């Protein structure tokens, strides 16, 4: 038993059927967007129908929104002639052809690698337009080539999500150390931090082991441990967006010429960060308010394209200050059946 997702035009008979709503990638290869279209024989000369896969990228900041400019670009646009008035098919496409009928025209897209995943920036209450981020869309045009204008009635628009999952290899656990020499003679202060693991799932607790060796003439006042999320925007040379999604301040003090080891638990979640405008979250379809953006994996030997999301645990000690950063990956694992891509309890 298998089921597909169908999108129908407001007018006429133009129905697009897609097997799955998520098209994941394995760095080396990307799952192809395979689907079918049913179009009624309502045309006389316009016997050409096109399918366009567009990886649109939009961005807007608070200062830019106030000024009145919002960046927009098309990272990758692929056009395929669905109707052949070569191109191997799949078992799902063959089953769709058999069930739908002879009019079922297939279309297959092979998404090239080194493309950003579907990540949408969280919009504030003021923003009411298109979602800011990278969105993958499939648009069906029943018109004579691309010369004619795009018609809302004829075109079928369906939002698809390209996401990555946690790698099979967990990777070495982060372990970051920093020794600082104070201006008062040669008095070294040592800080070290370690994580339970390198790959982290959304909602899972994060355990950080922090050890401080004070050989100075000052006492540490407070320790701030935060989970910074960084959103590198390669296009338009936009400045890096850094946002603390979780924080913990400890008033404990460490005496000079003494050692102190402790463990801290930080669990990032969206409820506390719901008011952070511009935060990068997972791909959205109809404003479902998905989880935090899964940290993209740059396994390629590394291209400046789209939005690159990363997470780092930052530990800061005051009395200047000593700051250390431990990168970690906050990515969803491979789901058993499929990602629902929506709030499972609708109400």
């Amino acid at each position: 038993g298998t089921r597909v997702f169908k999108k129908a035009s407001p007018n006429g008979k133009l129905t697009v059927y897609l097997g799955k709503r998520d098209f994941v990638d394995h760095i080396d290869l990307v799952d192809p967007v395979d689907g079918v279209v049913l179009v009624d024989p309502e045309y006389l000369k316009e016997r050409r129908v096109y399918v366009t896969l567009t990886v649109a990228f939009r961005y807007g900041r608070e200062d830019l929104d106030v000024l009145g400019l919002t960046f927009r670009k098309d990272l990758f646009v692929a056009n395929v002639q669905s109707f052949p008035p070569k191109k191997p098919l799949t078992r799902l496409q063959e089953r769709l052809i058999k069930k739908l009928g002879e009019h079922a025209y297939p279309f297959t897209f092979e998404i090239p690698p080194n493309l950003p995943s579907s990540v949408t920036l969280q919009p504030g209450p003021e923003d009411t337009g298109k979602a800011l981020g990278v969105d993958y869309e499939v648009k069906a045009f029943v018109a004579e080539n691309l010369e004619e204008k795009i018609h809302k009635r004829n075109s079928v628009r369906l939002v698809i999500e390209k996401v990555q999952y946690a790698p099979e290899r967990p990777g070495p656990q982060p372990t970051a150390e920093t020794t600082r020499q104070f201006l008062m003679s040669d008095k070294p202060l040592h800080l070290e931090a370690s994580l339970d693991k390198e790959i982290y799932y959304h909602g899972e607790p994060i355990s950080v082991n922090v050890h401080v060796t004070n050989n100075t003439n000052k006492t540490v006042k407070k320790i701030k441990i935060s989970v910074r999320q960084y959103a590198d925007i390669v296009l338009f040379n936009t400045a890096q967006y850094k946002v603390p999604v979780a924080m913990e301040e400890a008033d404990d003090t460490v005496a000079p010429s003494s050692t102190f080891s402790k463990v801290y638990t930080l669990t990032p979640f969206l409820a506390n960060n719901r008011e952070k405008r511009g935060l990068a979250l997972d791909g959205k379809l109809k404003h479902e308010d998905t989880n935090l953006a899964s940290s993209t994996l740059l396994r390629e030997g590394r291209e400046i394209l789209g939005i690159i999301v990363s997470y780092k645990v930052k530990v800061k000690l005051v009395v200047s200050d000593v700051a250390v950063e431990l990168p970690f990956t906050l990515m969803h694992p491979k789901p058993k059946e499929e990602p629902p891509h929506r709030e499972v309890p609708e109400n």
């Binding site: 608070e62 200062d63 504030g124 400045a239």
Partner: peptide, 17 residues
């Protein structure tokens, strides 16, 4: 202010031009 991103304990520290 733009480079520092979201400051600690804040949500939108953008500077109005």
């Amino acid at each position: 202010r733009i480079f520092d991103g979201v400051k600690n304990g804040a949500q939108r520290p953008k500077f109005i031009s």
